[PDB]
């Protein structure tokens, strides 16, 4: 590597929350170097030196009176002089109290590989090991972010306001580079999607679109194929590098009473596969350099929020710091982690404001909501159940274990697991069960592309291809265009249009957003709930049989109140609720009705 090989973060801003910045300087014996540099409101706290004479860290303190500009940093020593030309770029208006997506917002989730190929140039980039193979399942495909950028009126138009892509940072892996969560490089968007600049440019066509983007990172591990390994800057820089040692995913040991060490730091220090180092985040230099990469990444892109995968695989200790940091920098920002769990209680420990019983405590706003997800599912799938929605039910009566369940994101599917379609068994009517109940329950709904067009996939045994396929219409030449519809059958449009109808709808009700939830307990696979306020109640009321189903609605007063009939979102069908709701097979029914007294 030259003198001066990796700069980062490869710039910074004037008037960041945290003054702060210690850069990575990577480069040929740089670690030999003294830094020094000369401009107003910024100062040379020090600069630290390991064993590993290919790096420095310099800690700047940059003060509230520093302006943008650019200046050099010169480095001496090692018989030599080098000058690094930093620069601090002014913030956009408005940068710090940027509005992280919420509750009133619809999150569409896509893979760009498997997308759109809005450029086939790119596929393949000189330089980059993975050949595109597009009809690999694990291979690339040549998605990317002009392919995406081209599609936001689609997405826009199906009424989402949040688009979150799995990484794009970056993986220059020989094999399965495609998915993104094995980064090689933090301060670069994979050149196959585009450049940073590319990035920018998503952030901005999705926000005139009234669009966020929300950037899914990767705390915990890197790629093997990381720049970082052919040179590690430190002994400690990753764990177990030695030996292989996988995790064994014992995810409770942190948060267990019972715990032995050994499985709460396999938790957090142990490899997902040998292909992925895992960071240790107890050093404070990996910490620092994380934290600093995230926050680079929402302040130069103008993302709207975070989803952070593999959230309780980090330093919990680190995790600490690491939403105390995001969220001193951005305090109405909203940050998801990803914790695997269908269990409630394991998740909820991670929210911010949790009270714990040993202590812990966080800044993360938000978490998957994968035991509600779970329960759904299978209570769709359970067909065997007399009463499967009864989970549903129960796990969202524990929502008091969160101190914000509201805030939770609720996914009718992701790229981890079985599409929403063959979830529910490839039966409409329960998909659309899954669906109203996505876009009326009291959290954040996330979709996932293909699923408003039924995509289906196996769903037993290992299978993430199956759930990963192409969006059709994504490529040149593709038979099905689901942007168009051409190609599309009678059932998938009408699986679109109920996602563009609903979604769009949901836009418009604050009640969902904000409102009050009441459910009822599920009697034999029918369940009623309704969302309200002082200006609206809707009522949720579905069939999980096959056969019709009658309820009393003296059952439901408290929320009725007499109230002798309402309009049916869905089928715009007058329903009557005087003495009793007749449902229909397999059915579902959204009825609006006036506010309460
Ligand atoms: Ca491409
Ligand atoms: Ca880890």
């Not at 995406?148 to 138009?157: C, F, R, S, V």
């Amino acid at each position: 590597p030259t003198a001066i090989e990796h700069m980062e973060p490869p710039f910074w801003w004037a008037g960041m929350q945290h003054k702060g910045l210690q850069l990575m300087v990577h480069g040929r014996d740089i670690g030999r170097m003294e830094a020094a540099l000369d401009y107003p409101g910024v100062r040379l706290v020090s600069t630290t030196r390991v064993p590993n004479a290919n790096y420095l860290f310099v800690d700047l303190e940059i003060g509230p009176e520093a302006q943008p500009g650019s200046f050099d940093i010169v480095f001496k020593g090692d018989g030599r002089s080098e000058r690094y030309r930093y620069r601090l770029l002014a913030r956009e208006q408005g940068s710090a109290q940027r509005q992280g997506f919420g509750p009133g917002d619809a999150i569409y989730q896509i893979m760009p590989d498997r997308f759109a190929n809005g450029d086939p140039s790119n596929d393949n980039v000189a330089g980059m090991r993975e050949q595109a193979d597009r009809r690999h399942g694990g291979g690339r495909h040549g998605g990317d972010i002009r392919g995406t950028i081209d599609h936001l009126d689609y997405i826009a138009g199906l009424g989402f306001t949040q688009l979150w892509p799995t990484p794009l940072v970056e993986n220059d892996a020989a094999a399965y580079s495609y998915h993104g969560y094995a980064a090689t490089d933090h301060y670069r968007i994979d050149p196959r999607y585009g450049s940073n600049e590319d990035f920018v440019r998503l952030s901005t066509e999705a926000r005139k679109r009234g669009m966020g983007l929300i950037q899914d990172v990767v705390l915990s591990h890197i790629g093997k194929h990381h720049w970082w390994m052919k040179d590690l800057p430190t002994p400690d820089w990753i764990n177990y590098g030695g030996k292989f040692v996988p995790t064994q995913h014992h995810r409770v040991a942190v948060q267990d009473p019972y715990a032995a060490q050994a499985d709460s730091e396999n938790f957090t220090k142990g490899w997902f596969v040998e292909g992925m180092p895992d960071l240790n985040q107890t050093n404070p230099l990996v910490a620092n350099y994380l934290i600093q990469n995230n926050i680079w990444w929402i302040e130069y892109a103008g993302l709207s929020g975070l989803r952070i995968d593999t959230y309780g695989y980090s330093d919990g200790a680190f995790l600490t710091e690491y939403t105390r940091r995001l969220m001193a920098e951005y305090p109405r920002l909203n940050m998801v982690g990803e914790e695997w769990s269908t269990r409630v209680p394991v998740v909820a420990r991670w929210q911010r404001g949790k009270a714990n019983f040993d202590g812990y405590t966080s800044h993360l706003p938000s978490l998957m909501d994968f035991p509600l997800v779970d329960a759904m599912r299978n209570a769709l799938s359970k067909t065997g159940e007399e009463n499967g929605l009864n989970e549903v039910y129960e796990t969202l009566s524990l929502d008091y274990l969160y101190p914000e369940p509201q805030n939770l994101v609720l996914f009718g599917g992701n790229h981890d697991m079985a599409r929403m379609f063959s979830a529910a068994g490839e039966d409409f009517d329960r998909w659309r069960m899954n669906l109203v109940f996505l876009m009326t329950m009291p959290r954040i709904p996330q979709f996932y592309s293909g699923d408003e067009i039924l995509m289906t996939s196996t769903v037993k045994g290992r299978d993430d291809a199956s759930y990963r396929r192409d969006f059709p219409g994504g490529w040149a030449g593709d038979k099905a265009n689901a942007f168009s519809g051409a190609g599309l059958t009678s059932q998938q449009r009408a699986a679109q249009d109920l996602v563009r109808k609903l979604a769009n709808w949901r836009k418009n009700q604050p009640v969902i957003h904000n409102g009050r939830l009441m459910h009822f307990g599920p009697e034999e696979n029918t369940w009623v709930y309704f969302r309200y306020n002082k200006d609206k109640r809707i009522m949720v009321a579905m069939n999980n049989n096959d056969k019709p189903m009658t309820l009393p609605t003296a059952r439901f007063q408290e929320m009725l109140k007499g109230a002798p009939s309402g309009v049916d979102f869905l089928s715009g069908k007058t329903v009557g609720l005087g003495r009793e709701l007749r449902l229909a097979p397999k059915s579902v029914v959204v009825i609006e009705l006036p506010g309460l007294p």
